[PDB]
Amino acid sequence: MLELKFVRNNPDIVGRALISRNMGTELIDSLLEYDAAWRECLIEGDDLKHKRNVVTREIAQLKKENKDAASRINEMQGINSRIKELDDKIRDYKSKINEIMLSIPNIPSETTPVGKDENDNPVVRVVGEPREFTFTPKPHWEIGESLDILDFERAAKISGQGFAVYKGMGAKLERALINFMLDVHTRQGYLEVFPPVLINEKAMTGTGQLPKFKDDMYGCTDGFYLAPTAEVPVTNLFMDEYMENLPVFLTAYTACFRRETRGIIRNHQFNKVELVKFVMPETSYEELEKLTLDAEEILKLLKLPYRVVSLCTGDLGFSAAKTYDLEVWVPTQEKYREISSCSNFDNFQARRANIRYRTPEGPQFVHTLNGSGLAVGRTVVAILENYQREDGSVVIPEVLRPYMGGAEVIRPE
Ligand SMILES: Nc1ncnc2c1ncn2[C@@H]1O[C@H](COS(=O)(=O)NC(=O)[C@@H](N)CO)[C@@H](O)[C@H]1O
Numbered sequence: 001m002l003e004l005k006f007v008r009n010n011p012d013i014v015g016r017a018l019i020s021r022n023m024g025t026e027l028i029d030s031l032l033e034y035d036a037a038w039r040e041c042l043i044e045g046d047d048l049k050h051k052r053n054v055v056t057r058e059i060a061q062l063k064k065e066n067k068d069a070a071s072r073i074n075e076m077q078g079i080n081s082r083i084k085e086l087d088d089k090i091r092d093y094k095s096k097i098n099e100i101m102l103s104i105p106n107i108p109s110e111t112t113p114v115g116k117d118e119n120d121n122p123v124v125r126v127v128g129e130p131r132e133f134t135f136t137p138k139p140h141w142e143i144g145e146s147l148d149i150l151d152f153e154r155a156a157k158i159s160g161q162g163f164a165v166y167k168g169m170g171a172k173l174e175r176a177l178i179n180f181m182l183d184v185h186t187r188q189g190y191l192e193v194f195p196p197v198l199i200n201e202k203a204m205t206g207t208g209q210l211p212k213f214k215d216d217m218y219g220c221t222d223g224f225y226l227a228p229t230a231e232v233p234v235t236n237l238f239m240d241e242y243m244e245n246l247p248v249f250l251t252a253y254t255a256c257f258r259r260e261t262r263g264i265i266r267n268h269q270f271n272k273v274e275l276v277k278f279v280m281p282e283t284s285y286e287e288l289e290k291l292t293l294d295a296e297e298i299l300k301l302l303k304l305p306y307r308v309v310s311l312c313t314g315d316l317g318f319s320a321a322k323t324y325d326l327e328v329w330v331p332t333q334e335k336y337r338e339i340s341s342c343s344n345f346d347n348f349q350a351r352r353a354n355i356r357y358r359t360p361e362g363p364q365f366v367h368t369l370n371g372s373g374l375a376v377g378r379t380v381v382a383i384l385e386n387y388q389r390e391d392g393s394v395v396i397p398e399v400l401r402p403y404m405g406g407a408e409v410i411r412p413e
């Protein structure tokens, strides 16, 4: 969430932010009405609480001077009743202000381009040259079923639609990618952590998934949610702390769960290796450029042609101030497809989760950043498509061979 005082003082900064996201400004209008009622009730109640303290002492003084106190004791019943009414209103208004503040998206950065949707996302850079095929490439689901390394029919029987079972060299490729990704990020300076994927409500609120995106998440017995991304458990590790040794760079593998495209492009469960940073505010714009480079290094090392796109205001996520997407080439679609989002959140998540650090002039919120390095299933799609042979077998990218016993090609078994 934003800072309430800042929204009060700059309603047309915030309102134009919400129009740039294709929203109206009704939430700001509502917020400022409830805020004004809170402020006026606090003034009236603080005055009456002071008066009740004085009248209590006046009654004591009248009793010591042997004077009748009945008119004062009468006034006190009215004071006490009006105070109770004002406190009940203040309780209601604060609850309404908190609900509204948790629903207002982050302010887009000054370098986020203005646009309405994904058609207005500028291309930042194009890296690598897409393969020129001499035969007609097959999509990843046809290659995976023919090699018997992806099983959709048996996944549907145990789970349902939108799942996959990896088998044999498919399972070994996914495992090799995760190991490779975590090893490279370790060399880049990230600390490997492995957290749970059952998340409480406070953590899911902290990164912005709740309350707005509750219906997109799996909820579980005992009040838990399944993580939609390692962003949720990892970022919230430092909830209600003062952080040390900034910047802090973490990386994690987790399974990811989303209620929600063919094959493994869009599934209810998928694997992802995430990058998370906690940094001092003046450094976060450069930390985003550096995190993006750390994520795209995986694509460069795997020799998978890609491009980097800048998300416009209309396509930006709720909690993000600035995002770059990595988009990998998909031969059968003759287009690039999202494989990562890399974002700066400014202090939006840090305010929600109370993640601060000490400065000589007092405490400040950290900035948080994250990015996919990478979604593993979509990397398997990009390998099966871009490394396929005319015979339907798939060449194993050179960097993964040491993680696969020196295997060079996935063939039918
Ligand atoms: N349902 C899904 N199935 C498979 N892959 C997915 C699905 N949803 C997202 N992805 C992949 O996961 C990446 C990260 O998801 S994200 O929502 O864009 N961003 C995040 O979750 C951030 N925490 C950065 O990882 C995507 O860019 C996409 O490549």
Ligand SMILES: [Cl-]
Residues within 6 Å of the ligand: 016, 019
């Ligand atoms: Cl306007």
Ligand SMILES: [K+]
Residues within 6 Å of the ligand: 021, 022, 313, 314, 315, 316
């Ligand atoms: K939007």
